[PDB]
C-alpha cells in the first residue's frame, strides 16, 4: 500500500519524509490506421473523430525530503530508493523517477508584546520552531513499550512491514501530507500560545516575493499541488515590553533552538533497543521416565 | 545553591508584603548594564526595604 | 535495624525544634525586633494632609 | 509452621507426610511445592520444604 | 477496503439488484390434509427455502 | 459583556486588538478559521442620531 | 417500543476467536485476492450476510 | 419570593485579609494619587466592579 511504501523509504538514513505520486504517461492513437505513439504527430491528416488517447495505469514518482538541505539528492539516496522499490514491488507496477521535493516560500512578519519578566531569546526560538513544524510536520520513531503505552495491540503494532529503526505511527504518517493552503488564524494561535506572549499587535502573511509593496492581507495562501511550503528567511518579529522595543542577541537563540532539536535526535535513536516482546521459557527433564510398580 | 534566583524570590516576597513592586528593573536596567545587573538589582531591592518607613509616609 | 531506630530518634528531635514558637526562633541576643519588623508606632501613622 | 528435612535412604514421600501432618493424603501438594516429577524415587541428598496448611 | 488494496486501485460497492425465476409443479401425490398440508402451505415452505 | 458588566471572560479586555478576538474564537471547540474581521463603530445606528 | 433494538454485540466465542486469529495469519490484513476481500468484509461488518 | 436577596457579606478569606492589610500599610488611608483612590473604593464599596 501507499502508507507501507512511505514507511519503507522513510527509514533510509538521511530521509525525513516521502510522498508517492503517480505518473501519467500519454499515448496517442490513429483510429484510421491503427497506430500509436507518444507524439501527437500520430494524428497528422486525421479527422476529428479518428483520434484517441490513453493514459498509463501503474507508474510511480517518488518525492523525497532530506536532512541535508542541499539542492539535489545524493546519488547514494537515489540508489537506495530504487533498490528498495525494485526489491519489494507489486505485480504490474514500476518506478520511473526519484527526485527531491519542490518548495514554495512564505513570509511572516509581526509585532509581539511579551511579559516584563520573560526570556525573549527563548520565546523567539520556541515561536520559530512551532511555525516551522506547522508548515511541514514529520513522524517520529517509537519503542515497543511506547506503542503499548499508546494503547495499540499486537495485531496493530505489527500490521505493516517490519521496521529496523523503531515503530512508526500510522496517524502521524497520514497527518504529514503536503499542505495545500496557509492561513493566518492558525499562525496567530501558535504565537499566542507561547508562554510569555501577551499581545500580537501586528501580523501579516504573504507570498514571499520581490517589490513587496502595498498588497492584500492574504488571510489564506494556497500552495501548488506538488510543493512543500517553507519560511522564506526574510521573516521577522519585533519584540516589545510595554512600549519599548527590545533587541535579541543573535547567538543565544541558536543555542536554544539547537537544544530543542537535540532531544529529537536522541529520542529516535533510543527506539532501536526495544523491538520485540518476551516469550515464557521452560526447562527440560525427560518427562517419560518410568519406574516399575514391582 | 542557585543564589541569584533564590535571593530574588525572597526579596520579592518581602517587598510584596508592603504592596510594592520592582518588576520593571528586570529590563530597564539592561539599558544601563550588561550581566552585572543581577548584583545591582539585588542591592537596590535591599536598600528599598531599609528606607521604606520614610518612603511610604512622606509623600 | 539498629541504625534505622537511631535515625528515627534523630528525626523526632529535628521536628521538635521546628515547632518552637516564632517569638524565640527569631529573637535577638539583646531582645527586640529591630531588623525583623516595623512597629505600629512607626508603620501605621500618616503625615498630616 | 514451616519445616525442612534432608532425604535419607529408606524414605518415602507418603510416610514422611504422615509423620509431619498426621495424614498421608498431602503428598501431591508437597511434591508440587518442591518441583518434583519423579516423586516415587527420592534421591538421598535432597532437602525438601514442608509448607503449612492454609487457615481460612 | 480501498485503504488496504493498492495505491492504484479503488473498488466499488453495490446492491445486488436481485432478479429471479420461480417454480411450478405437479400436484403432490399425498398431503396430510387438504388444509393442513394445503398447496398454499407447500408454497409458503418453498418461498422460505428460497 | 463581561467588560461592561460582571460575567466570565478569558480575554483580558474587550478593548483589544483583533488578535485577542481571534484567539478567543480559535479556542472554541466548534471553529477552524475566518478570513477577515472588523469592528467599526455603528455609524449606521439610526436610533442614536446619525 | 415499535422497532427492534440495534447496534449491540456479544463477547467472542472460542470458535470465533480461533476463526479470526487463523484468518489474519493468512491474509496479513491486505486486500489482494478474492478470499481476502470476502473474508475481510465479513469479519469487519457484522450485519452483512453474503 | 419574587426577587434575589441583598446586603449580605461572608467572612474574610486569608487572601482578602492579607490583601487588605498590605494595602493599608502603603496608602496610609489617604486619598492622594490614582492607586490610592481606586483601591480605597474597591475595598470600601463591595458592589463596584471597576
The kind and range of the H/E element at A102 are strand A102-114
Answer yes or no: are the C-beta atoms of E2 and E11 closer than 8 Å.
yes
Helices assigned H by DSSP within A136-248: 144-149, 154-157, 170-175, 184-192
DSSP conformation class of H10: P
- The radius of gyration of chain E from alpha carbons, rounded to an integer in Å, stands at 22
B contacts of A116 (beta carbons < 8 Å)? 23-24, 26-27
Cβ within 8 Å, pair F17-A201: yes
Distance between H19 CA and the closest CA of chain B, angstroms: 8
Q: Is B56 on the interface with H (CB under 8 A)?
A: yes
Chains G, B in contact, 3 or more Cβ pairs below 8 Å: no
Burial label for B49, CB within 10 Å (0-12, 13-18, 19+), is: middle
Q: Provide the angle, in degrees to the nearest 10, between the axes of the packed helices A120-135 and A184-192.
A: 150
Residue D26 β-bridge partners = none
**What are the backbone angles phi and psi of residue A98, rounded to the nearest 5°?**
-120, 125
Cβ within 8 Å, pair B24-A116: yes
| Rounded CA separation E48/G47 (Å) | 20
Answer yes or no: are the C-beta atoms of A89 and E40 closer than 8 Å.
no
Answer yes or no: are the C-beta atoms of A205 and A107 closer than 8 Å.
yes
A contacts of B23 (beta carbons < 8 Å)? 116-117
| Rounded CA separation A159/A161 (Å) | 7
Answer yes or no: are the C-beta atoms of A123 and A197 closer than 8 Å.
yes
Give the sheet arrangement for strand A26-30, strand by strand: A35-37, A26-30, A51-55
| Rounded CA separation G12/G20 (Å) | 10
End-to-end Cα, chain E, rounded Å: 31
Q: For residue G37, what is the nearest residue in chain E, using CA coordinates?
A: E1
Q: Is A186 on the interface with G (CB under 8 A)?
A: no
Give Cα A21 to chain centroid, integer Å: 14
Of B17, B19, B59, the CB nearest to H32: B59
Distance between G36 CA and the closest CA of chain E, angstroms: 10
| Rounded CA separation A175/A169 (Å) | 10
A contacts of G30 (beta carbons < 8 Å)? 1
Cα-based angle E44, E45, E49 (whole degrees, multiple of 5): 120
Place of cell 470600601: H44
Q: For residue G21, what is the nearest residue in chain A, using CA coordinates?
A: A155
| Rounded CA separation A119/E12 (Å) | 58
Of A186, A199, A217, the CB nearest to F17: A199
DSSP conformation class of F38: -
**What are the backbone angles phi and psi of residue A179, rounded to the nearest 5°?**
-70, 135
Residue G14 β-bridge partners = none
Residues of D contacting chain A (CB within 8 angstroms): 37-38, 40-41
Size of interface A-E (CB pairs under 8 A): 15
Give the residue among G50, G49, G47, G38 at the shortest CA–CA distance from G9.
G47
Q: For residue A242, what is the nearest residue in chain B, using CA coordinates?
A: B24
Method: cryo-EM
Residue A18 in 3-state DSSP? strand
Cα-based angle A258, A264, A269 (whole degrees, multiple of 5): 125
Distance between H10 CA and the closest CA of chain C, angstroms: 27
Distance between B44 CA and the closest CA of chain H, angstroms: 19
Q: What is the DSSP string of F11-22?
A: SS-SS--HHHHH
The C-alpha cell that represents B35 in the structure block = 550581566
Q: How many CB atoms lie within 10 A of CB H41?
A: 11
Which residues, at least 6 apart from G35, have a Cβ–Cβ distance to it below 8 Å?
G27
The C-alpha cell that represents E23 in the structure block = 417454480
Quick one: CA dihedral F20, F21, F24, F28, positive or negative? Answer: negative
| Rounded CA separation A227/A21 (Å) | 12
Q: What is the DSSP string of G2-25?
A: -S---S--PPPPHHHHHHHHHHHH
Place of cell 517589490: A211
Beta strand extents in A85-226 (DSSP E only) = 94-100, 102-114, 141-142, 167-168, 181-183, 197-207, 220-222
| Rounded CA separation E1/G40 (Å) | 8
End-to-end Cα, chain G, rounded Å: 30
DSSP conformation class of F46: S
The C-alpha cell that represents A255 in the structure block = 543555542
A contacts of E8 (beta carbons < 8 Å)? 22, 57-58, 93
G contacts of E11 (beta carbons < 8 Å)? 37
D contacts of A285 (beta carbons < 8 Å)? 37
Give the residue among A159, A180, A164, A196 at the shortest CA–CA distance from A271.
A164
The C-alpha cell that represents B38 in the structure block = 543581577
Amino acid at each position: 500500500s501507499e502508507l507501507d511504501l512511505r514507511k519503507l523509504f522513510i527509514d533510509i538514513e538521511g530521509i525525513k519524509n516521502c510522498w508517492i505520486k503517480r505518473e501519467r504517461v500519454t499515448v496517442f492513437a490513429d483510429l484510421k490506421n491503427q497506430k500509436l505513439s507518444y507524439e501527437k504527430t500520430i494524428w497528422e491528416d486525421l479527422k476529428e473523430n479518428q483520434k484517441a488517447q490513453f493514459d498509463l495505469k501503474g507508474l510511480y514518482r517518488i518525492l523525497v525530503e532530506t536532512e541535508d538541505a542541499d539542492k539535489v539528492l545524493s546519488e547514494s539516496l537515489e540508489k537506495a530508493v530504487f533498490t528498495k522499490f525494485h526489491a519489494n514491488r507489486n505485480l504490474c507496477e514500476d518506478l520511473i523517477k526519484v527526485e527531491k521535493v519542490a518548495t514554495e516560500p512564505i513570509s511572516v512578519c509581526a509585532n509581539v508584546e511579551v511579559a516584563p519578566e520573560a526570556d525573549e531569546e527563548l520565546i523567539h526560538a520556541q515561536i520559530l520552531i512551532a511555525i516551522e513544524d506547522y508548515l511541514a510536520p514529520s513522524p517520529r520513531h517509537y519503542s515497543l513499550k511506547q506503542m503499548v503505552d499508546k494503547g495499540y495491540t499486537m495485531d496493530e503494532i505489527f500490521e505493516g512491514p517490519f521496521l529496523e529503526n523503531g515503530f512508526i505511527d500510522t496517524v502521524e504518517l497520514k497527518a504529514s501530507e503536503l499542505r495545500k493552503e496557509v492561513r493566518l488564524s492558525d499562525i496567530i494561535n501558535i504565537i499566542m500560545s507561547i508562554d510569555g506572549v501577551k499581545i500580537v499587535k501586528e501580523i501579516t502573511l504573504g507570498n514571499c516575493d520581490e517589490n513587496d509593496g502595498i498588497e492584500n492581507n492574504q488571510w489564506v495562501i494556497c500552495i501548488p499541488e506538488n510543493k512543500k511550503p517553507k519560511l522564506c528567511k526574510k521573516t521577522t518579529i519585533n519584540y516589545f515590553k510595554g512600549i519599548l522595543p527590545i533587541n535579541l542577541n543573535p547567538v543565544r537563540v541558536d543555542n536554544h533552538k539547537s537544544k530543542i532539536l537535540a532531544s529529537r535526535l536522541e529520542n529516535d535513536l533510543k527506539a532501536k533497543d526495544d523491538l520485540e516482546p518476551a516469550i515464557p521459557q521452560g526447562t527440560f527433564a525427560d518427562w517419560g521416565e518410568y519406574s516399575s510398580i514391582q | 545553591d542557585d543564589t541569584i534566583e533564590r535571593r530574588n524570590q525572597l526579596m520579592d516576597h518581602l517587598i510584596a508584603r508592603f504592596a510594592e513592586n520592582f518588576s520593571s528593573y528586570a529590563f530597564l536596567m539592561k539599558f544601563l548594564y550588561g550581566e552585572s545587573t543581577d548584583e545591582i538589582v539585588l542591592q537596590d531591592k535591599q536598600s528599598f526595604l531599609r528606607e521604606y518607613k520614610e518612603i511610604s509616609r512622606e509623600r | 535495624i539498629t541504625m534505622l531506630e537511631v535515625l528515627c530518634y534523630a528525626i523526632s528531635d529535628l521536628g521538635n525544634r521546628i515547632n518552637i514558637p516564632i517569638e524565640d526562633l527569631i529573637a535577638n541576643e539583646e531582645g527586640g525586633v529591630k531588623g525583623q519588623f516595623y512597629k505600629v508606632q512607626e508603620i501605621l501613622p500618616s503625615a498630616p494632609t | 509452621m514451616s519445616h525442612y528435612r534432608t532425604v535419607k535412604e529408606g524414605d518415602t514421600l507418603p510416610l514422611m507426610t504422615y509423620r509431619i501432618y498426621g495424614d498421608s493424603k498431602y503428598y501431591l501438594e508437597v511434591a508440587k511445592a518442591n518441583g518434583l516429577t519423579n516423586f516415587r524415587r527420592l534421591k538421598t541428598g535432597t532437602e525438601l520444604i514442608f509448607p503449612p496448611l492454609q487457615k481460612q | 477496503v480501498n485503504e488496504l488494496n493498492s495505491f492504484h486501485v479503488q473498488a466499488k460497492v453495490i446492491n445486488p439488484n436481485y432478479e429471479e425465476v420461480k417454480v411450478d409443479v405437479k400436484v403432490k401425490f399425498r398431503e396430510g390434509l387438504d388444509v393442513s398440508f394445503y398447496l398454499t402451505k407447500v408454497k409458503e415452505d418453498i418461498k422460505k427455502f428460497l | 459583556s463581561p467588560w461592561a458588566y460582571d460575567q466570565e471572560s478569558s480575554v483580558e479586555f474587550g478593548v483589544t486588538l483583533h488578535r485577542s478576538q481571534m484567539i478567543h474564537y480559535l479556542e472554541q471547540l466548534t471553529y477552524v478559521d475566518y478570513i477577515t474581521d472588523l469592528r467599526l463603530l455603528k455609524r449606521q445606528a439610526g436610533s442614536s442620531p446619525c | 417500543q415499535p422497532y427492534p433494538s440495534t447496534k449491540g454485540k456479544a463477547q467472542e466465542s472460542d470458535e470465533d476467536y480461533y476463526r479470526r486469529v487463523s484468518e489474519r495469519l493468512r491474509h496479513k490484513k491486505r486486500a489482494i485476492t478474492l478470499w481476502d476481500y470476502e473474508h475481510l468484509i465479513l469479519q469487519k461488518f457484522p450485519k452483512v450476510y453474503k
